[PDB]
Design a protein around this nucleic acid. Structure first.
Ligand SMILES: [Mg+2]
Ligand SMILES: [Mg+2]
Ligand SMILES: [Mg+2]
Ligand SMILES: [Mg+2]
Ligand SMILES: [Mg+2]
Ligand SMILES: [Mg+2]
Ligand SMILES: [Mg+2]
Ligand SMILES: [Mg+2]
Ligand SMILES: [Mg+2]
Ligand SMILES: [Mg+2]
Ligand SMILES: [Mg+2]
Ligand SMILES: [Mg+2]
Lengths: 190, 97, 86, 139, 143, 139, 62, 63
RNA sequence: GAGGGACAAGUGGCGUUCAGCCACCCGAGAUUGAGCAAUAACAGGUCUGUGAUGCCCUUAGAUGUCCGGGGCUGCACGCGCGCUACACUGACUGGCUCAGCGUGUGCCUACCCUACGCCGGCAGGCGCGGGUAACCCGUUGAACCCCAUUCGUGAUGGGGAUCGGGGAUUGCAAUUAUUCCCCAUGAACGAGGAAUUCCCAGUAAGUGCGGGUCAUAAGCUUGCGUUGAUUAAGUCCCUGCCCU
């Protein structure tokens, strides 16, 4: 009877401000689940991966590099601490800024090869929105990992700081650094 | 008093089981069921080759040991009367009183 | 014998930086002065920003917890989560 | 709450330099004292583990050095010490930092007179327990 | 009301029981465990000073769980991941000396009855003791 | 009144005996609030924190699990509760409400009524895993 | 320097040295039903709203 | 998936050539009719032949 | 154990009458993984598996066979398959909690699985019992994992190589190899250049267990379990293949 809630949350009125990423984030009421550790069997159909929630996708991309290859309970705990830190940082809801980070955490176009079997000019082409979600989650978790590598800060604290510095246009996070690294090369090879 | 029928293969197992139940239905004995045992398997892996040339290509040899147990409370004369069975040679019979 | 490696990446963060074992007089006084100014009392921020080790940071945070100035939200394995009211 | 005690780095046995992170892990810096022996000497001296090396009394330091120079008066049986029965004296004792290198020099000095191959492979550029020396012992 | 030890979380139960056994004074600790005893196959000693009462509380909880375990069975209950170094790790076992020590101490303090085929099992006096301790732990939890 | 519904996780089986009563869920003598990981104290309560409280107060189910992994046991308990409610609503309650609550469970999740047809594959005789091979050696 | 959006009507085929991009004749939402052909790499369906940084190009098919 | 073997299609054509009135447009009935009138040991081959028999029935019912 | 259940069957669309392809649902699955695997060849390996064998060589001081030592483990070096780390997602300590293949004795000829109790800190020893096995080990209370303390970016408590002393077990004999345990010694290693290997869902990887040699004996290999990714589901651009 109650609303579908993560912890003591609400999971409501999280509005995606734009188009081209709608119906791919599972923030809505029809795909609201209590934990990211769900039955993830989304690798059979080509287009059933988009129905996965982005918090579960963030946990799945967070668990990498052999020594932590697995441990969904540990990475769901890390994302729980990260959402708690983002909430305690002056409100500004962690699910809302997570959606904002998926929107504004990297590529809007990429450059790749064309055919013709001649000179590779690396023409700047369009990029799939699913591929934008994939590369955004990958850049966020990679930046959080190498920011929390060899320091006193934790994985959850650097992931929270990465999501905040990616939702806010401060140009101080590694996702925005590789956004610069991709879009300056894309404008140069445009 | 129990009787164990241990067979080499499943077809002779089911044939001797059907024959024994068919011979045990008509008598005045409370015949217990043919209690199924878990099938034993001896898996053996072999190099396939005397000298080591090529990929690590391995055999997989198996057996399927099948076993059934029944319980028949009876006097020893009736047990020795039931003991005479025209049987497939792939079936071994053990008795315990 | 000889020392050879295939990569060259030197110049780390700060040159074997020193860090205080026990709290000083003026350092702990500054901690008590500006500890309400921080909103998210986390031991990593208290250690890296205020020249504290992790053990002395956890000791000071447990001391202020026993004094009752900063409310604990949820303590866990290595993410100590403290918040000050107002 | 122990604000500050005027103690940074001690001096034990004229060669060793005590650290500043703990007391057992600073006695670990003494050669001949490693992982378990320092915590055992600390538990015999009855010192709380939260206290540092800079918060500890010099009389208690002398008590720790007394436990070092004679552990067998109270406790710590003969199995736990570094130097076991084969001494050429038959004495059950713990080696010191300056003493351990001297005992190793005496070991090698008598093995050179024995001319055993263990001492021979230690005198040459070989390994005693290095049963394969293709990759082991390069450069 | 009726309090079962499974109804209450264990990390309050053993943490209180390690102090209630200190209050009751139910421990034997002869000489070598007074001196020092290491772990399974390790390099260090346990940290929290009431580790004897902690082992005794874990032994009491496991004999409430399974009645008929022994020295080797409880040693396999404890168990261990023996990190060897360059050689990879395996599953080693704990020490049998504490495994017979805790059972002998609880038998001397009248909490372990021996099985005619196996080992330890529960007693009615220890049942009353653990049930009242679990009840007051549940009362401290609900209050 | 007495319907036992079974498991069917990958290597986990949870026998779930149902009973009419005053509100109880027994998991191996241990109640509903005790979950062996602390992280999953929202997923196992999905038949509880979504379907209401009068259903919990009306149906008593004891659950005994012979699983092999922790996550497998958690999903086995979840599937056993979510199918034992369906079996109790087949055997005692009318189909006009059983179909409604079944449509609610299906439109919420797929794994509440449908099991997972995923078992681990056999390790191959060429490589170290079920798909992988060892490293080659070229020149 | 406008940045417009466009939803996919049809999918022509796949193109590339790796076979990675997809030649998509998308459509124009903000204007009338006009036609440009775009190279999109990554998975795409019919109806995916696409971010366009330059609406001046036209890819060719073969 | 339905790129069936020539011996499978040939057996189904022999079935639809000899016995037509015994066959209907239901798979679960046509399989039992084909196993009453023919001998096929493999149950997957039974399902394959009976599926192509139903496909031929749906072709004959149209044209 | 028998039988069923799944066959692209039913719907819409594309396809030539066809052959077939894409999405839905009922279903557990819209098909998993292996074995066998054609004609003809390599002048591929094995005479060191065979009392399987042709030719040559030795047959009495033997190139036959036994017994006692050494050796294949020998290192100024380079290469391949592997294990462990280069830490904080972590290391240590304490508590909690889960399995599956498969193995086990008085043998067509010398041998285990160990439960319970006692002693010792430890590896271990002693007394006794069960199992020729769904009976007993064993409800394999497994590791990661779930909580609490300690460590605090320092070649540090990560890493345990090297080396010294000692204690137990199999074997007639371990020292120039057993193995294990206790203390101590604490190097290189700061995520690896040129180049290169494997992989599409219970998948790679993390982690543990069983079998083979076994007496002591796994870092190899075969199988089994726990947790379990990211992203493709397209191409012939590198390599190779099939048909004109
Ligand atoms: Mg690795
Ligand atoms: Mg190589
Ligand atoms: Mg002859
Ligand atoms: Mg050799
Ligand atoms: Mg050689
Ligand atoms: Mg090889
Ligand atoms: Mg270490
Ligand atoms: Mg060190
Ligand atoms: Mg590991
Ligand atoms: Mg053996
Ligand atoms: Mg072995
Ligand atoms: Mg080998």
């Amino acid at each position: 009877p109650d609303i579908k809630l993560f912890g003591k949350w609400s999971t409501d009125d999280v509005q995606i401000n734009d188009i081209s990423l709608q119906d791919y984030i599972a923030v809505k009421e029809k795909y609201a689940k209590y934990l990211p550790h769900s039955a993830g069997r989304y690798a059979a159909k080509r287009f059933r991966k988009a129905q996965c929630p982005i918090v579960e996708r963030l946990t799945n991309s967070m668990m990498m590099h052999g020594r932590n290859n697995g441990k969904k309970l540990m990475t769901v705990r890390i994302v729980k601490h990260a959402f708690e830190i983002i909430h305690l940082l002056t409100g500004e809801n962690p699910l809302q800024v997570l959606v904002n980070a998926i929107i504004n955490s990297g590529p809007r176009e990429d450059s790749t090869r064309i055919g013709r079997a001649g000179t590779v000019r690396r023409q700047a082409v369009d990029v799939s929105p699913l591929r934008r979600v994939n590369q955004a989650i990958w850049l966020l978790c990679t930046g959080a990992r190498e920011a929390a590598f060899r320091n006193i800060k934790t994985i959850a604290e650097c992931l929270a700081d990465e999501l905040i510095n990616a939702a806010k246009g401060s140009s101080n996070s590694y996702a925005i650094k590789k956004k610069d690294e991709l879009e300056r090369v894309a404008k140069s090879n445009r | 008093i129990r009787i164990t029928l241990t067979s080499r293969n499943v077809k002779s197992l089911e044939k001797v089981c059907a024959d024994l139940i068919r011979g045990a239905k008509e008598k005045n004995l409370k015949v217990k069921g043919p209690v199924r045992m878990p099938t034993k398997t001896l898996r053996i892996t072999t190099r396939k080759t005397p000298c080591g040339e090529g990929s690590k290509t391995w055999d997989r040899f198996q057996m399927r040991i099948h076993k059934r147990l029944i319980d028949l409370h009876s006097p020893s004369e009736i047990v020795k009367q039931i003991t005479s069975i025209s049987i497939e040679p792939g079936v071994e019979v053990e008795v315990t009183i | 014998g000889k020392a050879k490696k295939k990569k060259w990446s030197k110049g780390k963060v700060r040159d074997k930086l020193n860090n205080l074992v026990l709290f000083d007089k003026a350092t702990y006084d500054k901690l008590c002065k500006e500890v309400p100014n921080y909103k998210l009392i986390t031991p990593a921020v208290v250690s890296e920003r205020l020249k504290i080790r992790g053990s002395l940071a956890r000791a000071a945070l447990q001391e202020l917890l026993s004094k009752g100035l900063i409310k604990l939200v949820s303590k866990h394995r290595a993410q100590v989560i403290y918040t000050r009211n107002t | 709450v122990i604000p500050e005690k005027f103690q940074h780095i001690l001096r034990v046995l004229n060669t060793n330099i005590d650290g500043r992170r703990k007391i057992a892990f600073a006695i670990t810096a003494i050669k001949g004292v490693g992982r378990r022996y320092a915590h055992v000497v600390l538990r015999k001296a009855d010192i709380d583990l939260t206290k540092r090396a800079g918060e500890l009394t010099e009389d208690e330091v002398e008590r720790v050095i007394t436990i070092m120079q004679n552990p067998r008066q109270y406790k710590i049986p003969d199995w736990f010490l570094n130097r076991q029965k084969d001494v050429k004296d038959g004495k059950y004792s713990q080696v010191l930092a300056n003493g351990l290198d001297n005992k190793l020099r005496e070991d090698l000095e008598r093995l050179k007179k024995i001319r055993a191959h263990r001492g021979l492979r230690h005198f040459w550029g070989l390994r005693v327990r290095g049963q394969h020396t293709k990759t082991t012992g390069r450069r | 009301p009726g309090v079962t030890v499974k109804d209450v979380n264990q990390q309050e139960f053993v943490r209180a029981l390690a102090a209630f056994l200190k209050k009751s004074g139910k421990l034997k600790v002869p000489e070598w465990v007074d001196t020092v005893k290491l772990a399974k196959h390790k390099e260090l000693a346990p940290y929290d000073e009431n580790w004897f009462y902690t082992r005794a509380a874990s032994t009491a909880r496991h004999l409430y769980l399974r009645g008929g375990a022994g020295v080797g069975s409880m040693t396999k209950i404890y168990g261990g991941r023996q990190r060897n170094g360059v050689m990879p790790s395996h599953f080693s076992r704990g020490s049998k000396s504490v495994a017979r020590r805790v059972l002998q101490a609880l038998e001397g303090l009248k909490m372990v009855e021996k099985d005619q085929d196996g080992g330890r099992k529960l007693t009615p006096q220890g049942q009353r003791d653990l049930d009242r301790i679990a009840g007051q732990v549940a009362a401290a939890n609900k209050k | 009144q007495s319907v036992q519904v079974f498991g069917r996780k990958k290597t986990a089986t949870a026998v779930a005996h149902c009973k009419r009563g005053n509100g109880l869920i027994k998991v191996n003598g241990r109640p509903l609030e005790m979950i062996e990981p602390r992280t999953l104290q929202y997923k196992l309560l999905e038949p509880v924190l979504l379907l209401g409280k009068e259903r919990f107060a009306g149906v008593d189910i004891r659950v005994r699990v012979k699983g092999g992994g922790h996550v497998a046991q958690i999903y086995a308990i979840r599937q056993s509760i979510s199918k034992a409610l369906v079996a109790y609503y087949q055997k005692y309650v009318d189909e006009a409400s059983k179909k409604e609550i079944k449509d609610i469970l299906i439109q919420y999740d797929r794994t509440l009524l449908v099991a997972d047809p995923r078992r681990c594959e056999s390790k191959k005789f060429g490589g170290p895993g079920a798909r992988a091979r060892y490293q080659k050696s070229y020149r | 320097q406008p940045i417009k959006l466009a939803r996919v009507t049809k999918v022509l085929g796949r193109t590339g040295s790796q076979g990675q991009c997809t030649q998509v004749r998308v459509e124009f939402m903000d204007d009338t039903s006009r036609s440009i052909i775009r190279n999109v790499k990554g998975p795409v369906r019919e109806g995916d709203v696409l971010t366009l940084l330059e609406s001046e190009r036209e890819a060719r098919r073969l | 998936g339905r790129v069936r073997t020539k011996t499978v299609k040939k057996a189904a054509r022999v079935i639809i050539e000899k016995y037509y009135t015994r066959l209907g447009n239901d798979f679960h009935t046509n399989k039992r009719v084909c196993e009453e009138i023919a001998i096929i040991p493999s149950k997957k081959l039974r399902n394959k032949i009976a599926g192509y028999v139903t496909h031929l029935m749906k072709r004959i019912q149209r044209g």
